[PDB]
From a paper:
Peptides based on the hexapeptide “LLGRMK” block the interaction between capsids and L-HBs and inhibit virion formation. These peptides bind to the tips of the spikes where envelope and capsid are in touch but are distant from the hydrophobic pocket.
Both variants formed icosahedral capsids with protruding spikes and adjacent holes. The overall resolutions were 3.2 Å with B-factors of 139 Å² (P5T-HBc) and 158 Å² (L60V-HBc), respectively. The maps of P5T-HBc and L60V-HBc were almost indistinguishable from WT maps (local cross-correlation > 0.9) except at regions close to the mutated residues (local correlation < 0.9). Here, L60V-HBc showed somewhat larger differences, which affected the spikes surrounding the 5-fold symmetry axes (AB spikes) more than those surrounding the 3-fold symmetry axes (CD spikes). Next, we built models into the maps of L60V-HBc and P5T-HBc. While in WT-HBc and P5T-HBc, the phenylalanine side-chain of F97 pointed towards the dimer axis, in L60V-HBc, it had an additional alternate position pointing away from the dimer axis. Based on the density observed in the EM-map, almost 50% of all F97 side chains must have adopted this alternate conformation. The alternate orientation of F97 in L60V-HBc increases the adjacent hydrophobic pocket similar to the smaller side-chain in F97L-HBc does, which also points away from the dimer axis. However, local cross-correlation maps and DSC indicate that the mutations P5T and L60V impact differently on the capsid properties: While the mutation P5T weakens the stability of the whole capsids (lowest TM), but leaves the spikes unchanged (high local correlation), L60V stabilizes the capsid slightly (largest TM) and changes the spike around the pocket (lower local correlation).
Author numbering:
A (entry chain D), C (entry chain D), D (entry chain B), E (entry chain B): 1 to 151
B (entry chain C): 1 to 146
F (entry chain A): 1 to 143
The structure:
């Protein structure tokens, strides 16, 4: 079909194509952020929000893909094809999962309006040619880059 | 007829020449930004804005220019002239379209007054000597302060 | 994308396919009608109407295409390919511009309802086989074909 | 100085450029019509209307042009060049004066709005290919379509 | 006659004498800034403000100076003396016109009080020895110190 | 740009083309008139009038030209080139500067409408053929 898992939330696959391919953190770092900020709500028995539902589903499917990787590394004798499949699962399927994770963790941490405005502004930034581009790329944050809160 | 594509919007061809010619993103990146942000409005059977009207027209005209370039590639046998024509369509007309798409997408995203003050300020900045101007190049951003 | 520059106004590319390919006036005649009826409004600094916006954009792009034609006629040494490109720009791209011009000038002069009704009626006329087709094709006009207004 | 003699009245040299060369009566017939419809007003010491002012001026410059033609015919001994200049004066300048006289006589007879809509509709008719238009040009006249003066 | 072109506006040739020679954009950049910020007001038939009057006059005298430079380059056969005069016109008189254009464009952009306090503070900064002053000259700009145009 | 320095003051360059090139007094005479009539107001720190602003600007741009001329006469060793360029500075730019000074001093002294009617009347006088042209050329005066 044509689900396009972001258009339900307000972004699209092409709106997230503003961000380059290597912009997204690693799958380990994104799973660490998830378990560090929303573990007790991702394990609760209630529909907390659509982001929580989609994030639970994403994590279960990555778990199914990591079980696949373990199984193939255990069961395939041909090492060339074995490492081929494992590297494919880890990188080429991993990129789609990291784009999915980044989006959900960031839209939970900062908000839909903030994440969409950040996507637009980072599109502007990465579009602007290098010679006329400021060094301060836009970034998501809840505090100013320097925070003078003495006590 | 001596028509400005920007005079009704409050800009001018010389006001968009006030920025470096290589400041504007590629036509590919700008068409991607348009289809990523306002596709459902650039395909609806409503006007919704002079910017949507002008942006629909601009994209149709670029599609016609790209069909021209494909036709040239297929139907010109002389490679020198063929690649000269294609390079012209991609660089001169491509620069004019990138200046046009940038203006309309940026206006729709940020605001007419915001984009005009940005044009003026970035033009003044790129001309101020380096030691007496803020060090970071100006940029447009929807992300507020925290 | 799928802009279809008429569906914003109420027609479509297929509704304007009722009219044959050679029905549309020349680009020179349509630019003359434009500069004879709406020049002071096409050069004004205000959004007069969506037809005016689209017509300004169309005229600027035809100007860009005529600058292309001048450039190629000046810069291409190979005469065969030069005249090939110039004839292409003038006829095959010209037809699309004349369909665009005719539509906008007529919808400004006569009105959207009148232009759409004319498209439907000319579809009926040009569809009817020649033997059962009246000689009076439908035409757009603000006066009767004969106008007895003595003084 | 690039002056349009109709722009003052609402027409345009590009709006009257559609009426074919054979559309206008001869200079003699248009002068007879002027002197038989508005002689007592084109010979009065009163500012009657802009059409009267322009008609007076046009007739004076045609008188000067006819004096020119007579002088050429009398004083150019070369018959070839003499007939060349006479033909030029009687056809090119003659057509311009026929277009100018027709416009003013017809404005005075019918009305500004009437003659302008007539020019518009005749442009629409003369731009259509001969195969898609009613075969009888639109007519501007004071007579009924039956041409029977009752009462 | 010992006229101060800024004393009328509140500055003084001795108040602008502190801004170094490298502080001002080139004549070309300052003319581009003028013609891109206030062209429709520097070309209007209206007395807009003393800054507009002085800007019009300054630009006319620079036009005369550029005509002089072109005439020198064309008509002085001696290359040494020709380049000598051209260098003089482009550097000395050029610096005076850069100082004059900067002052008027900056007044029109920012304000009399703002540009005067800026000149005062820049004088304080440029008079201090390099060892007792903050290393970054004071800046007059419309951009935020972050140079990110939001809203 | 097409700034046209007289447009704001109500004239145009083609209106001042009514007066010939050899009609305007020397720049010396015009500067003498200025320093005799409006020195205390051109040296004042006040926007007295747009004519005062334009006249201050013109006087400063002429002072810069004269400094250029002196600098050239001192520093250019080639006498031919030096005399050529100083003669250019004195005549070809002095012409436009005495046009500007004439316009502004005359407007200040007599009035905008008076100077404009003078320009129109001088157009009439210089267009009239010589056989029907009075020997008394038009002249500006408040007497």
């Amino acid at each position: 079909m044509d689900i396009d898992p972001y258009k339900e939330f307000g972004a699209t696959v092409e709106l997230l194509s503003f961000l380059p391919s290597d912009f997204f953190p690693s799958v380990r770092d994104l799973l660490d952020t998830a378990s560090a900020l929303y573990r007790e709500a991702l394990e609760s028995p209630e529909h907390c929000s659509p982001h929580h539902t989609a994030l639970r589903q994403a994590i279960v499917c990555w778990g199914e893909l990591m079980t696949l990787a373990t199984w193939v590394g255990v069961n395939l004798e041909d090492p060339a094809s074995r490492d081929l499949v494992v590297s494919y699962v880890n990188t080429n399927m991993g990129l789609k999962f990291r784009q999915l994770l980044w989006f959900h963790i960031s839209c939970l941490t900062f908000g839909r309006e903030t994440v969409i405005e950040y996507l637009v502004s980072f599109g502007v930034w990465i579009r602007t040619p290098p010679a006329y581009r400021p060094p301060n790329a836009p970034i998501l944050s809840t505090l100013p880059e320097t925070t003078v809160v003495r006590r």
